[PDB]
Amino acid sequence: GPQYLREGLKLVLSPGLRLFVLLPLLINLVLFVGLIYFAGHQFSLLWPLFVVLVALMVFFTFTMLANIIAAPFNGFLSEKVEAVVRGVDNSPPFSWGELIAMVPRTLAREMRKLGYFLPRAIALLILSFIPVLNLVAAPLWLIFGVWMMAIQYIDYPADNHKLGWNEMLAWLREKRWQSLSFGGIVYLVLLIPVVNILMMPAAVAGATLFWVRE
Amino acid sequence: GPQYLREGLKLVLSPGLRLFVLLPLLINLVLFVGLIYFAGHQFSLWPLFVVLVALMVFFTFTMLANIIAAPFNGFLSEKVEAVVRGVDNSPPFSWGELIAMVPRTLAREMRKLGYFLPRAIALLILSFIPVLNLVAAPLWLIFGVWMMAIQYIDYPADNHKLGWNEMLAWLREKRWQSLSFGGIVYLVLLIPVVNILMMPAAVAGATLFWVRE
């Protein structure tokens, strides 16, 4: 179960994939470093509450944009990590221009993902401030959190092969244990603020692997 | 433990105290009704940003609510002492008396919030650290009960001149019964409707706390 993710690390490190692996890993890192540069300088440019608050704003918008921009790039590698473990062994000849074709579909999928996320995200936040109910908000956030990991990454290979919007989810439901496992371990590793930059493509690798073996 | 609070409910209903009981009970009631009127009309004028102004007006409303209803509590607090003590039932205290407490209660309240806000903000930051959140609400429950103890038990202990720290120390000296009183009081605070009546019952119970210990 975390083995999918580990093998995803093995494949993400494959010499043939390294182009397609390092491609979104560089735009993601400059954005990660691009954060603290913009956060250090501009964020400085009652009150404590408001500051923690707007900080959270910044974090939310930052995350959301990071995902919507890295969305197509992940969908691309998804096909390629599939290729490697499948027919076209290791390095598969895919050109740059290819990326142009995935732009509409991947972005549609991503925005659909955020439209699934936000309302349940808002519901859990509101449960988080009902003085005696809060005791179960965080464990709900956590479970909803890792299921949100599952669909986020298991969506890439299952969109490359045409699938309905709900259908994917239903399949995600049709085997909840392994989904929750994969999303789970990918979440645990997601926590680490440094190694995660490499583990995010490791994620989509493991997820394409996940559909391949199922 | 909650019997001191219940006894407060008995005292808060005593025919002699009904003046001093119905003094803050009306200004708090009109502020409770005054909340939803202003929130019904003005809030529309104002989703994440929406939830933002929402929580903002909620907790800021409670803040101004405390700094406004602060003097009236201290006033009643002196009476429930008197009532259960020497001057039985109705104790003859006139309106102008209040004027003497306004400077002290406000200088005590902003100290409570000075105590509260940074610990409040300390827990909020704890509530967004991914795997650590699992214990943020339990802390918030404990911290929320201890925030009821020092809220009300501070009234009679401020009538009898005590330091801001010293009170806390005494509250620390007997943690269990403090957490008890503040505990039940918090549990009754949750009720959105009955709390308006149990808010004055609480301070009565707290003076009772200072008295019986």
Author numbering:
A (entry chain B): 8 to 52, 72 to 240
B (entry chain A): 8 to 53, 74 to 240
Please quote the paper that reports this structure.
CysZ family members are 28–30 kDa bacterial inner-membrane proteins found exclusively in prokaryotes with no apparent homology to any of the established channel or transporter folds, and are scarcely studied in the literature. The CysZ protomer is an alpha-helical integral membrane protein with two long transmembrane (TM) helices (H2b and H3a) and two pairs of shorter helices (H4b-H5a and H7-H8) that insert only partially into the membrane (hemi-penetrating), forming a funnel or tripod-like shape within the membrane. The protein has an extra-membranous hydrophilic ‘head’, comprising an iris-like arrangement of the two short helices, H1 and H6, and kinked helices H3b, H4a, and H5b. Besides not resembling other transporter structures, CysZ mediates sulfate flux into cells or proteoliposomes without coupling to ion gradients, partner proteins, or exogenous energy sources such as ATP.
The structure of PfCysZ was solved second, to 3.5 Å resolution, with crystals also belonging to space group C2. Although PfCysZ and IlCysZ share 42% sequence identity, molecular replacement failed to find a convincing solution, and we instead used SeMet-derivatized PfCysZ to obtain phase information by multi-crystal SeMet SAD. Unlike PdCysZ, both IlCysZ and PfCysZ crystallize as dimers, in agreement with their different behavior in detergent-containing solution. The PfCysZ dimer is also arranged in an antiparallel orientation but with a different dimer interface. In the PfCysZ structure, helices H4b-H5a together form a narrower angle with helices H2 and H3, and tuck-in closer to the rest of the molecule. The resulting dumbbell-shaped PfCysZ dimer is predicted, by OPM/PPM (Orientation of Proteins in Membranes), to lie in the membrane at a 31° tilt to the perpendicular, in agreement with the position of its central hydrophobic belt, as revealed by surface-electrostatics calculations. On the other hand, the PfCysZ dimer resembles the transverse pair of protomers lying at a tilt, just as was predicted by OPM, along the side of the PdCysZ hexamer when viewed from inside the plane of the membrane. Disulfide-trapping experiments of the transverse dimer, performed by crosslinking a pair of mutants (L161C-A164C) on helix H5 of PfCysZ, as well as the corresponding pair in IlCysZ (V157C-Q163C) confirm the dimer interface observed in the structures of PfCysZ and IlCysZ, and, as a consequence, the antiparallel assembly of the two proteins. The ‘transverse’ dimer structure of PfCysZ clarified the possibility for ion permeation by showing that openings in its two protomers aligned across the putative membrane; however, the prospective transduction pathway would then be open on one side to the bilayer. In the case of IlCysZ and PfCysZ, this assembly may have come apart into the subsequently crystallized dimeric components during the process of detergent extraction from the membrane and purification.
